[PDB]
Structure formats: C-alpha cells, structure tokens
C-alpha cells in the first residue's frame, strides 16, 4: 500500500516549480496526489554495495608440506635453508644436542633450521566499503486504475538524477543516503557461501594468520603452525586443526548481509533512510491529513532485535481509520515521557486490517515500548545491552 503526502510535505511557488520533501524507507511506498492527474508513487527499491574492495584474508585452515631440515654439527657454523627467504614458508631456527651418536665429532649445541611450506586451504575475506559508492535505486510509477515504471539509479557521489513523468513533466530528484551501520567501523566478512557485517577491530584482533588484499605473504602463521622440540636431527611441524567452528561461533552475535542472486557481488542492505527533495515544475498537488489511531491494535510481530541496536515491531490496525500509529518509549508506565527515538518516519496504516512495520531505538537498559494511547495501548518491556564490538 502507498501513503499519501501531507500539505507541509510539498510547497508550490508563485513562480518556478513545486518541491516535494519526502523521507524514503525500504519497502515503504509514498504517493504524490495531483488533482485531475494520476497519483505518482515513489518507493525506495534497494540500497546496495557493489564490488567492495577485499582488504584482508584470514586463514582458518592451513596445509603444510613435509619438513625440510638443514642441520650442522658444533663448530661448523649456522645451518641455513634457501627456503628461509621465501615468505610462504614456515621456518624456525633453534639448536639441537649433537655428539658422537648422531655424526658429530665433538659434543654441544648444533645449529638447526626447519621450514615447511604454508598454504591456506580455507580463508575468510574482509571487504572495505566505499561510502562514496553506496548505491540506492528509486522507483516511480504512475498509479494504475502511460503508467510505465521509471527506475532511477543513484550512488552517494551522484545524488542528483533526472526523470520525466506523464502530466507532471520533467523531474529532478536530489537524494541522500543514511546507512543504518557505520561502514567506516565495519567490514563485510565473507566466510563460506555465507556473509556478515563485522566490526573492523574485532577482525584485526583475531588470532589467525592474515593476508593483505594487496597480496603478499601470509603473516603470523604461528597461530596455525607449531614447531616441536628438536631431537638431535629432526623437528616436527604440526598444522593446528581447522578453526572454522571457533570462527563461526564468534560470528553468532553479528548481523548478516545477503548477496543478490544474480549480481552475486551486490551486498544489498535493508536499513537506511533516503532523504529526497523531488523538484517539479509548477502544479497544484493534493494533500492528505491523518488522524491519530484511537482503537485497539495488536502486535503481529513482537518487538525484535534487528542487529544494529534498533527494534522492529509489526502492529495491526484492524478498526480505526487511515491513521498514524502513536509510538513512544518510556522509562516507566506512569509519565509516558518519551526517552527513546522513533526511527520509522510516519507510521501510517493506510487501510484497516493493515500491518505496519515500526522501528524504534530504546534507551540503554530497561524501558517500556508503548504503542497507542490511553488504556487500549500495547505495552512491551525491553532490555538493551552494552553493545560490544564482537563475540
């Protein structure tokens, strides 16, 4: 269903054109009504990240070759292997007890070096998000009842795009993005076929070998490679067991991303408000008023955590009217003095028996989610935790 704009949402000038100022959320439509002309629908289709740069790989399962060992007797110098200079080898130097029993003339410590080639069987990719290339697509079709669909393609840097509509004429949309998470503090972690949004610092502090997105050598191999004590001519090297399970566990408290089925590198987001100023030539537009809902509502989906500190609920308005759903978040049931923040812009049930999504930002700690007003109001208690960076 589509929601009509109010009078204050647009402004018609004596000379020039009429500007519409709408805040667009995902999967919520907003319609523009003009007398003797079809209503114009405007909806945010998607917010996506296209081709993020891989900034780091994290190994969680390694494979070694056999152990190459050069060893020298006492008073014969240092034992060197030419593999010590290859960066993809796991090398270690030490001294082993030598003597007559193992082919050395005099007793004492003999130099010894062991190297084993390090390959990464399975790695986790960490992607960098360029916020100047966050895409957002806006659709605009004339109401059906030349009703073709106009799809405009945006990206943070290019925020001004043009279009034309029947009757309304040429249009200019000047839009902005506000992401739901800070991609300056976050990576896109891609382990198997799955993917997540993880914090940057949580990812650098992992005790696993890592490799730059630019390439190079696998650094800090010692998290998966272990060198046993020597026995006079030999050193055992062990690749520590696969660590996918330990990594998949630490990603439990991390929100997920979904690749597009076709593009397969489009990481399309869900949260995010697109603030557009629609610019049109001069024409009178139709407004719409909304009374506040005054009848009993019900939680279709009880308030749930979204992954980025906000709570989503889905209430049903079966009776009242095309109406605005009053939502506040308070410390106590007494004052009804709001302490939270209403993320959702204009929670409006267009028709009766409709189900409306509502996003809210409770204060940290205990609070009460209040939907409605008076005595036929929904009261849901909430708890909010300290928002660690991981684990």
């Amino acid at each position: 269903h589509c929601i009509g704009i109010t009078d204050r949402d647009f402004i018609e000038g004596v000379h020039g054109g009429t500007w519409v100022s709408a805040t667009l959320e995902q999967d919520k439509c907003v319609t523009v009504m003009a007398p003797d002309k079809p209503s114009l629908d405007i909806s945010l289709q998607t917010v996506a990240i296209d081709g993020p740069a891989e900034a780091r790989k994290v190994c969680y399962s390694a494979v070694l070759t056999h152990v190459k060992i050069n060893d020298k007797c006492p008073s014969t110098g240092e034992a060197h292997l030419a593999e010590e200079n290859d960066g993809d080898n796991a090398c270690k130097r030490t001294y082993s007890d030598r003597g007559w029993g193992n082919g050395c003339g005099l007793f004492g410590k003999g130099s010894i070096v062991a190297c084993a080639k390090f390959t990464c069987a399975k790695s986790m990719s960490l992607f960098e998000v360029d916020q100047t290339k966050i895409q957002y697509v806006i659709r605009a079709q004339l109401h059906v009842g030349n009703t073709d669909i106009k799809t405009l393609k945006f990206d943070a840097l290019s925020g001004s795009q043009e279009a034309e509509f029947t009757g309304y004429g040429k249009a200019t949309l000047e839009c902005q993005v506000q992401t739901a998470v800070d991609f300056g503090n976050s990576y896109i972690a891609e382990m198997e076929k799955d993917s997540w949004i993880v914090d940057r610092q949580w990812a650098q502090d992992l005790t696993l070998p890592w490799q730059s997105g630019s390439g190079g050598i696998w650094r800090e191999m010692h998290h998966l490679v272990e060198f046993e004590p020597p026995h006079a001519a030999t050193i055992r090297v062990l690749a520590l067991g696969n660590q996918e399970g330990s990594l998949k566990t630490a990603l439990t408290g991390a929100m997920r991303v979904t690749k597009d089925e076709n593009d397969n590198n489009l990481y399309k987001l869900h949260g995010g408000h697109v603030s557009c100023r629609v610019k049109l030539s001069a024409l009178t537009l139709k407004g719409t008023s909304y009374k506040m809902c005054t009848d009993k509502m019900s939680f279709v989906k009880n308030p749930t955590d979204t992954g980025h500190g906000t709570v989503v609920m889905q209430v049903k308005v079966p009776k009242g009217a095309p109406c605005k759903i009053p939502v506040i978040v308070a410390d106590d049931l007494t004052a009804a003095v709001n302490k939270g923040i209403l993320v959702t812009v204009n929670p409006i049930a267009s028709t009766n028996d409709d189900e409306v999504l509502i996003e809210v930002n409770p204060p940290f700690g205990d609070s009460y989610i209040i939907v409605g007003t008076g005595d036929s109001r929904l009261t849901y208690q909430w708890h909010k935790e300290g928002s660690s960076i991981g684990k």
């Epitope: 070759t65 056999h66 060992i69 030419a82 082919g103 080639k117 390959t119 001519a233």
Partner: antibody, heavy 117, light 112 residues
C-alpha cells in the same frame, strides 16, 4: 653455471650390484636436498631416493627400500646411489637432481642402466 | 604407465600457439598448487621452465605460459620456434607421503 654430472651407469646382470655417482658444481652442495629419479621403459618419471642437505633425512620408494642406498659427500660435492639386487624393473635412465622450494630444480644429463639376464 | 596424464604427441607449425595438458586427479594437484614443467632435449638435462603453476625461472622465454583449472595443469607455447622441439614433463607435489608424481611425457614436434 650450476651443473650435475651422472656417471657409473652401464650394463649388468640381475642380482648384481651397481653404484651411481653425481658430481655437483656451481652451488653450495651442503645446503640443498638432492634426489635420484629414473625413467623406466614405457613408464613415467619416478623419484626413488631423496636425501637431505646434511644426509640426516632419507626417503625411499617401496620398490627400492631394501635394495638401494643413497648417500652424499658434502665435502667432495658427490651424491651417491648404491644399487644392489638389481632386477629387470630397475632398467631405466637415472637422473640426479636438486630439490629446492618443494620442486625438482636442476637435473643432470642422466646415465643409462640396463639389466639383461 | 603414469599417475599424471599428458598427451603422448603434440605437434605444431612455427609461429603457432600450442598447448600441452597435464591432467591429474583429486588430492594430486588441487591441494598444494605447486606444479612444475620441465623441458628435455634428447641427451641433455631436463630444464625447469615453469614452477608454482604460472611462475617462470630466469631465462625462460615469455612464450612459455602456465595455468591450471581443477585437475588439468596446462603448458602453453606461443610463437613456436624450432628449438622448442623436446619432451615436456609434469610434476606435482601430491601429498606428504608420496611427495612428487610425474607425467608420462609429451613429444613436441615443430614441423619444418
């Protein structure tokens, strides 16, 4: 530059003994692993003996584990292969090669070992 | 005959681009990604022309290229010269027990 030279191949009867020698130059012999490789008639190449830089680690294939014995003289830049209990299956072109980086690097011209009863 | 499989005979005219394949099995080439290619003129020593799939030692011409997809490692020679006529071999570090397995060899012919 780097060179390996095989010698000691020839003709011998089954059950007999033969010793292969491989002289190296152009690199530090005591720093690199060396190995013996043979190419049997109608078969692919096959490493049969593998020795470490100091001679402390020895590896053999099952076909030769009891019969062949590989050694090296890092003072004389010589790699040896003592072949005992020679059979018909052991007739092949025999190579000595260096192994650095988990790949066989430099080879020798090879010496021919024929066994006919 | 062998464990790695390469065609017995391949031939090409001078200037042509010729590709020699080396088909391995699973747990023969897919794990370590270190595959070597050798060239042997008759009576001479085999010369390493490719190692680590795509890497080329010093002095090996840019005509020789290396690639791999799944089981099949491939050697490709472009600008085929007369000198390239030799036997080409294929080595792969299979596992920690057998270490290296070789290809049967491939006779390359330059039609003059």
């Amino acid at each position: 530059e780097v060179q390996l030279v095989e010698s000691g191949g020839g003709l011998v009867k089954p059950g007999g003994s033969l010793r292969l020698s491989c002289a190296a130059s152009g690199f530090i012999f005591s720093d690199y692993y060396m190995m013996w490789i043979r190419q049997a008639p109608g078969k692919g190449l096959e490493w049969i003996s593998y020795i470490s830089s100091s001679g402390s680690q020895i590896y053999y294939t099952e076909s030769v584990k009891g019969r062949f014995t590989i050694s090296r003289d890092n003072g004389k830049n010589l790699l040896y292969l003592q072949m005992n209990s020679l059979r018909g299956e052991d007739t092949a072109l025999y190579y000595c090669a260096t192994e650095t980086g988990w790949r066989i690097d430099t080879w020798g011209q090879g010496t021919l070992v024929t066994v006919s009863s | 005959q062998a464990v790695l499989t390469q065609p017995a005979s391949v031939s090409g005219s001078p200037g042509q681009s010729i590709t020699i394949s080396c088909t391995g099995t699973g747990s023969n080439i897919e794990t370590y990604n270190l595959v070597s290619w050798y060239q042997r003129h008759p009576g001479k020593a085999p010369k390493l022309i490719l190692y680590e799939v795509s890497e080329r030692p010093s002095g090996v011409s840019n005509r020789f290229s290396g690639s791999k997809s799944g089981n099949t490692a491939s050697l490709t020679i472009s600008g085929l010269q007369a000198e390239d006529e030799a036997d080409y071999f294929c080595c792969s570090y299979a596992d920690t027990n057998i270490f290296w397995v070789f290809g049967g060899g491939t006779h390359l012919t330059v039609l003059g």
